[PDB]
Amino acid sequence: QQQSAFKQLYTELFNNEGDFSKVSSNLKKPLKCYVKESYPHFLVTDGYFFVAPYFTKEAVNEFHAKFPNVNIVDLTDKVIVINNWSLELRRVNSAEVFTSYANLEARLIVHSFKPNLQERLNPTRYPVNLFRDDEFKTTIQHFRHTALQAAINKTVKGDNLVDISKVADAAGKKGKVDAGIVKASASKGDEFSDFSFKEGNTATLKIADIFVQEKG
Amino acid sequence: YEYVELAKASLTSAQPQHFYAVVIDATFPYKTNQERYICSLKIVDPTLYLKQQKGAGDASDYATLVLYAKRFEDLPIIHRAGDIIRVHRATLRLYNGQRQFNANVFYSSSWALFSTDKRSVTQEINNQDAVSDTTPFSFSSKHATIEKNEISILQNLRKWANQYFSSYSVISSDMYTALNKAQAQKGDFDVVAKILQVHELDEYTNELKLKDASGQVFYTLSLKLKFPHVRTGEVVRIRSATYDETSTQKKVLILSHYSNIITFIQSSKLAKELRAKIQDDHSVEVASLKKNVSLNAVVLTEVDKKHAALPSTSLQDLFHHADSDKELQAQDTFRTQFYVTKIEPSDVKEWVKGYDRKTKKSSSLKGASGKGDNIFQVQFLVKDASTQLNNNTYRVLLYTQDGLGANFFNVKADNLHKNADARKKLEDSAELLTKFNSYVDAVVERRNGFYLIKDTKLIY
DNA sequence: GGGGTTTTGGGG
DNA sequence: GGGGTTTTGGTG
DNA sequence: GGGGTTTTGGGG
Ligand code: NA
Ligand code: NA
Ligand code: NA
Ligand code: NA
What we know:
Chain A is of the alpha/beta class and 216 residues long. Chain A has helices spanning 5-15, 57-66, 134-155, 164-167, 209-215, and strands at 31-38, 42-45, 49-51, 53-55, 79-91, 104-115, 128-129, 181-183.
């Protein structure tokens, strides 16, 4: 039984081809989490791991409406309750986004969250980046392995085996190792991208814009 | 510079004192705030190394050393227990019953590391020789001086360090927790186990498979850059680890930025006994093969003992730099790791073909023996951590006509169209090789631009 | 006081 | 000091 | 000059 709510949610999402509608319904309940950081990176934890929530332009306006005396960029060490949220997969540059792995990211799209101001939460372990967890990293690798295998078994055909003579009687034969390079898919670039899941799309706000909106 | 022994250092002078000592423990240099870095360690010497033995339990006694600095690079990185450290301008005081030496490197204090063994850890990794036996392999500030009168102190402390580590455990049972009791710990704890496996999880992370005296197996992530000295079959001490309650598929240890992984000097009695006592375990692998999806990695092969000391080469260098790198161009035999994405020919029955050694041609045995000697002609499409993101797959050949890799499958070549037993064994192997988390560790020989497997055999 | 440095006698 | 960063958010 | 440190103004 998984104790980390985030790990279980993000895990199922990946194990279900990024289809948020296929994830257990008994897990789409409100999320009460501790705010570890708020700027330059807004990070919340579930007692075990920390994730980066992506607020929609609506979610923030609603917030500022019901809570005029509360600045989001100052919710550090405070607790919030995300009543309306969704999960979706996105392709990113893991070299720049630390909240991802293997150029893939599971985003927590927040639509509505309430700040339970001054509510002390129970003592927990030090929160770690969910995308740095061994099992979750492995779960993601499994995801790519399945996509890669399906693509290769579709792209590679005809059993183009190196003629045995090329490797036999190779005394006076010289070759270039790049001859063993085989394209995995019909991808456009030099990066594998033949995935089946449909990359989610939703306008989200940059943590910087919300900073200016509260203190130019 | 006058050097004083640990037990004889003044507790009242409060004046700057200097000394030589053996490091038995140390955290990793970690940042505390916006301007401070710290490194805590345990030191010992001929005057302070063991507690009143009678009811002590041969427990080790030691002094502590806390080095403060404004920069990460001004603090010592201890990779191995048993080495020597020289400190200048340190203040001693009693901290909870024990001697605590404090030194502000950002002010006037300084340190220098001396290798107890022939080479430092870093030098062993790069196969380098030490300038001399009086040269520090690491030190703070732009300069370090060694006077003639020090040579004796250093040489003697080295002899002592070896006698100490060979006669005592140094890292006593009270300095670490049994892996099978890790879940009972309230917070963090220490570990002393053997590295059974080093699995490259990705570009910057290694996954260590650990097993200690309790017989319990654990996995932990170890960044390559931070711990480049991790080696299979070696015994290490892990400073500060936590039990991962969120891992259900396998036992996982969590490390922090201040955690450290340390090896032992050659003379280590504890390391020697553990290297022999603790034996490899495959129970985790055997069990994982029964699951449709295993979150545990499984190395299905093993290379001949004569290659165990051979360094590995990534697929990236093997297929993208083998014809442009001076070093790679000089070698014909390499060792590497990868996972099979697809196997050709698709029909397992065609894996064994008839071979005519006169026309250098091979053919299907679906027409029987009328083709010549039976040989394996399998083409593996592989991938690894170094090429995990690119849109490529790489061909690794298994052509045994010349005897290379003939026993890879533990099944002698035969007509798979007629030998049901041989066909079934290869079919199961095929499913294991293409199964997620299955990896191959093999030696390959470069021939006419292609890599052929050799001296490698499945172990499942 | 004493570093490294240049300030080469004096701030905080 | 047996600890919790980040222009470093996969040495810190 | 400026840190840390305590010398709290002044050496070399
Ligand atoms: Na001065
Ligand atoms: Na001066
Ligand atoms: Na001064
Ligand atoms: Na002063």
